[PDB]
Amino acid sequence: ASSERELYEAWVELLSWMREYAQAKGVRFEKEADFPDFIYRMERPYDLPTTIMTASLSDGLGEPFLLADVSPRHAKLKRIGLRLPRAHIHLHAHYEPGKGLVTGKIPLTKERFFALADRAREALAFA
Amino acid sequence: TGPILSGLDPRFERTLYAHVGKEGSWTLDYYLRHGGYETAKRVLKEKTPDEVIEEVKRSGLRGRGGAGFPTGLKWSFMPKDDGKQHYLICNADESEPGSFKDRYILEDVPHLLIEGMILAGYAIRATVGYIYVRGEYRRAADRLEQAIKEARARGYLGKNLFGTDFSFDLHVHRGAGAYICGEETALMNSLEGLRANPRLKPPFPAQSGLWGKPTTINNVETLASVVPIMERGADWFAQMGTEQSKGMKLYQISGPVKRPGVYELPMGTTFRELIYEWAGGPLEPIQAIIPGGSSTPPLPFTEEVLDTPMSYEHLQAKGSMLGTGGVILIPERVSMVDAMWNLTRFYAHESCGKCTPCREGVAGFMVNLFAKIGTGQGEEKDVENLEALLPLIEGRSFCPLADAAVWPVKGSLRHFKDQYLALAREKRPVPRPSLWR
Amino acid sequence: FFDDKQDFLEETFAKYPPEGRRAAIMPLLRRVQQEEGWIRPERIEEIARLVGTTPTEVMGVASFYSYYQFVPTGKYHLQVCATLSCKLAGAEELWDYLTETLGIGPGEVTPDGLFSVQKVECLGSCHTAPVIQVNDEPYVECVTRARLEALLAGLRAGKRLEEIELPGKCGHHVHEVE
Amino acid sequence: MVRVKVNDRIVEVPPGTSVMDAVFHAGYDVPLFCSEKHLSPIGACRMCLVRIGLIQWQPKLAASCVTAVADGMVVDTLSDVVREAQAGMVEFTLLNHPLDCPTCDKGGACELQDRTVEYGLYEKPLELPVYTRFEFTRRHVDKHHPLSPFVILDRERCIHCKRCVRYFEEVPGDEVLDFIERGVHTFIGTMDFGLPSGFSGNITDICPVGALLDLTARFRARNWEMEETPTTCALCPV
Amino acid sequence: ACPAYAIYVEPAENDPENPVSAGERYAKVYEINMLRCIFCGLCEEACPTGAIVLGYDFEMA
């Protein structure tokens, strides 16, 4: 499917949010990894709009409180994930065309996300 | 009747229940007023430890968890007094799916269990017992804490007993769920308050275990069945089923079957008898039956299958085993893929991560195959893959969780293959189940 | 936390052999879990200090199990079974409805703050499938749109499930059809 | 002394020594990731699998870093079933290992890396060559994470041997690392900060993958290029 | 890879704000000695991101 395109565009969305919330609170933004399928590309033409496979929001102490990973080109169940560490909470965004980025069937929106971030932050952070 | 006692006939007498469903039966005094605690008094004032072993070793009792190890032998490994402690751990975290026999034993007739642990305790010279009750069972955990205070107050579960010199006590330790904690070695860590992962196997707890001192673990059924044995003789026990398949067992059933529940049937009984005579036939014809536990692998609905006994000696040979007697019936409305999908998303959840083969292999590789097949993004390749994955997992785990997760998917590709190949090869997702009321 | 609760400490520490000290982690946690509804760092640091063991161990033990929590819960922590049997009675579809009514999925809290949701695996009461467990208060056997909506409507109106009742019939240890 | 025959060669072996050593002693070889010298085996990485005879083989492959030794024992590490099971395990471990060799500062000296090239032989005369049979998204977690002024911690890389945790528990007696969740989700992490102990750093050599690295020497040369000069530490009298 | 020891690469730790290499690690010093070199091209084949790629200029002296 063309889901691919929307998925990546949604991944841009997640990133966009992460910079604003991050700068707002003074909590860090951090790139973790960049795609193998970018680093090791060198003659297969690149098409994607970002280079970042994994990224996180970190607290004052320096442990992450939120991890954010997209699936790259290779994948067979392409998804974007969130994970709160230590909490055993794992969220799976699929895309449903036009509906949005959904966690199952619930739309994942900015407001949703800010709340998710805050409950993470307030609970897990030590700083 | 007679020494091959199968089915309902007038000479089989219920004993493991006859009090459940009648609320207000968890009083010490209700139990006492049935003539209870005589049998404890008798063994304590009469027999030696050796005799209460030797009797049971004949009786036909054998492991009643998701294992079958003839219980005589299991006590035979005890050191029989050196000055070292001994502890009897009642494993009431039976939380393997499809299984719920143990739940009510704890809830309505606790003082029975407790008596059984007094009996067993005395035999292996153990002085303290932990009952590791499943954490989410709230009712059971109340009733057990309750029972143990009562029994202790009136002093039959005390620091000295009768005119005797055996002494015994119990503690409840309410768990926190988690299937893997059920495994016998896992439990000893779990209880000890470390993280729950199994231990190595060259010490057996009998020969050295829990905090250095030798431990014994027995199952809720196993313990409950000790009282009838000790009461009425080994002979009274031995009549039930074929030999090496003695005793009754608390069979349970679910699915779209007419009257599911616990049906206390003798062993060696046919499925046919259970599903029809007792459980009032099905509601939709069957695609497969997973007989006992969730460990065992499905058997297609067959006449020759229905007519096979329930034992550790007839289901053995049929490429299954008997888990907890908790049968599940699978109707043919839904897809086998969608059944196993749910089953192996469960097993994958509950691994412990200690082994590579089962950490990475099952909970990361295998499961995703299922996903692939059952989303219609599948292909023939994936089933070919899966097939080859199985001998690479079975062998190589460190504890038996893996083997319980592979067998269902092992058995299921021989018999129901067609469907798997269908949904994958044709790029067709599973249909949805349609049975929510 | 257990500073006021010192009888409770004597009570749980007494049960074990003195050399088996580490056992206490499970109950000590379990007290914090029921009464404040989700563990906090300070609790674990204290629990650690008490049992005379480094925090990191206690963290590992604590983080293993299914029951324990570490984030904002609601009032009614909704625990839907997702295993085989339950699927066959349409537990799947239950979770679809439930979640889409409330407006939140896993590890989130409802805007009122009365509802957290969370999956769980086989609860071992397959015959009366499905089931849910709210908080730690006995199993709501069966779920049907009615039975559910009654449970909901009560909780929403300021009454628990231990103090109200539902339509239907769910038996003692046998029950009927599916 | 107990008489063991591995494949076709015999070894003496003082009674009660793990099979693994008797294998290596005989000159045949097995891979192994979880059991380092002067640390107890808790056979867990599932690599050291052999088949054993006592003549009759056995229905399951024993992990040689665990079971004892006995009379006239045969231990086999050439057979079709052995190599096959190993091929399996190599692949399984590698399932979630993130790609990083060129920038991995564990360089040409990585137990995972080398084991792969040693044992991972599928079936491939004149066929297509085959590489990794995984084809779903990997684990992804944080990495490059300082635990202390001397130790940086990746958390993606790790293969979940027990070596580092095991060490901390047995040897300096201070626990400061221990596993977190469970199933596939599990990851090593801290809950004490700075790693207090004068002996924290040793795990860096101990980790047989590149998960645990020496921050003072993070990015200052690739592992092999160094000239490796044996000498003695004189900053104390030990 | 080289059989002349002609390529010396001192690595360095990437700025996070102005990365000069896509990966987390880069080459603060990259030197190549022509007067040693033999022009095998094993370097390029060995390089996994194919960064070093033999040229067309050759009028060097």
Ligand SMILES: Cc1cc2nc3c(=O)[nH]c(=O)nc-3n(C[C@H](O)[C@H](O)[C@H](O)COP(=O)(O)O)c2cc1C
């Ligand atoms: C992976 C695994 C999980 C197990 N889980 C349980 C359990 O949840 N409950 C239980 O009573 N026994 C369980 N057992 C078996 C018991 O630990 C023990 O071996 C058995 O119950 C002893 O026989 P008896 O209980 O019939 O006396 C498990 C065994 C294995 C290998």
Ligand code: SF4
């Ligand atoms: S087989 Fe699984 S659940 Fe069992 S010890 Fe190994 S990783 Fe743990």
Ligand code: SF4
């Ligand atoms: S970081 Fe290394 S030593 Fe620690 S468990 Fe992992 S692979 Fe083993």
Ligand code: SF4
């Ligand atoms: S730890 Fe080893 S196998 Fe992993 S990226 Fe590093 S050099 Fe490679």
Ligand code: SF4
């Ligand atoms: S072509 Fe490259 S590998 Fe060959 S000598 Fe030159 S610098 Fe070395």
Ligand code: FES
């Ligand atoms: S499958 Fe739900 S209670 Fe068993």
Ligand code: FES
């Ligand atoms: S070295 Fe044997 S299982 Fe790890």
